[PDB]
Amino acid sequence: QQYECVAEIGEGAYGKVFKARDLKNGGRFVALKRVRVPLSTIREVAVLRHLETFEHPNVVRLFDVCTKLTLVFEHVDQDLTTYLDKVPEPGVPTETIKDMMFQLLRGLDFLHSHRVVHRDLKPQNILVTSSGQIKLADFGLAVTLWYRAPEVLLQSSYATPVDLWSVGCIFAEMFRRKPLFRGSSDVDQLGKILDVIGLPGEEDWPRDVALPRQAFHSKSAQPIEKFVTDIDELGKDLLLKCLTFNPAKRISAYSALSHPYFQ
Numbered sequence: 001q002q003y004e005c006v007a008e009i010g011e012g013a014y015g016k017v018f019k020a021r022d023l024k025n026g027g028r029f030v031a032l033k034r035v036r037v038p039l040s041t042i043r044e045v046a047v048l049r050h051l052e053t054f055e056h057p058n059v060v061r062l063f064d065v066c067t068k069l070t071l072v073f074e075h076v077d078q079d080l081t082t083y084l085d086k087v088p089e090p091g092v093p094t095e096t097i098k099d100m101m102f103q104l105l106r107g108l109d110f111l112h113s114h115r116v117v118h119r120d121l122k123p124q125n126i127l128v129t130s131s132g133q134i135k136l137a138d139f140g141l142a143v144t145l146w147y148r149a150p151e152v153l154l155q156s157s158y159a160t161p162v163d164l165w166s167v168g169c170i171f172a173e174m175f176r177r178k179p180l181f182r183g184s185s186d187v188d189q190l191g192k193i194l195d196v197i198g199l200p201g202e203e204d205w206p207r208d209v210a211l212p213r214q215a216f217h218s219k220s221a222q223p224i225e226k227f228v229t230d231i232d233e234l235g236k237d238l239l240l241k242c243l244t245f246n247p248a249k250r251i252s253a254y255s256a257l258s259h260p261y262f263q
């Protein structure tokens, strides 16, 4: 074969991800993702190859596709989880947070402008390169609920703002070094969210969902500087715009790129 698996990176309800030696290309490490056995899949692979033509710096490179399905990506040594675990006290430098967030938002805007929704954005699939570059992985192909948007939890809408809620959760965690909303179920996750942001207006609550606004009594919105210590005034404004309950009122990745926090 053209590839030689040397270690396992991950396993789950997708298949397995292996760290492999790319024999033909000077023995460089690559990440091979193996998938199961359609037509919606043919189309998803076509979008992946098309996104690769842009070679965006803030998404993992796709080097090959094999015929069950093998996806060959550029290998990157660590994820954001291991990065946050190893960073010395008192934490991630203030400008390292800003730079990683800008790159996260560039990769996300690239994906959103090409009508790809990530849907499972978390530190586990945000990869940190040897030179400190952010690269997005595990997207374009169809478990922790800590980064799930309220509209996904409520099962109402699944548009691009879903990823901006996840970004807000990641932004807060870059400061905290611990997840912001650590719920044990969809109902618990929603409860934990509203204990912080507060209850939205009855007209910001989606109609025809199973969970009504009355199922929660999470009274007032608590100040965010309590849960996210050391965040500046600008970072706080951007954090709140990502963590807006109504997805139609939530900031997009494109406007986030223009926010004064990145000046």
Ligand SMILES: CCN1CCN(Cc2ccc(Nc3ncc(F)c(-c4cc(F)c5nc(C)n(C(C)C)c5c4)n3)nc2)CC1
Pocket: 008, 009, 010, 011, 014, 017, 031, 033, 060, 073, 074, 075, 076, 077, 078, 079, 082, 124, 125, 127, 137, 138, 139
């Ligand atoms: C059990 C924990 N230990 C210690 C911590 N360690 C973290 C870690 C995470 C990622 C990498 N490397 C890497 N490089 C390039 C890639 F493109 C992918 C990649 C591609 C995909 F398509 C994926 N799809 C899914 C679902 N994942 C998951 C596997 C995250 C994908 C990952 N991964 N190296 C280390 C994992 C093993």
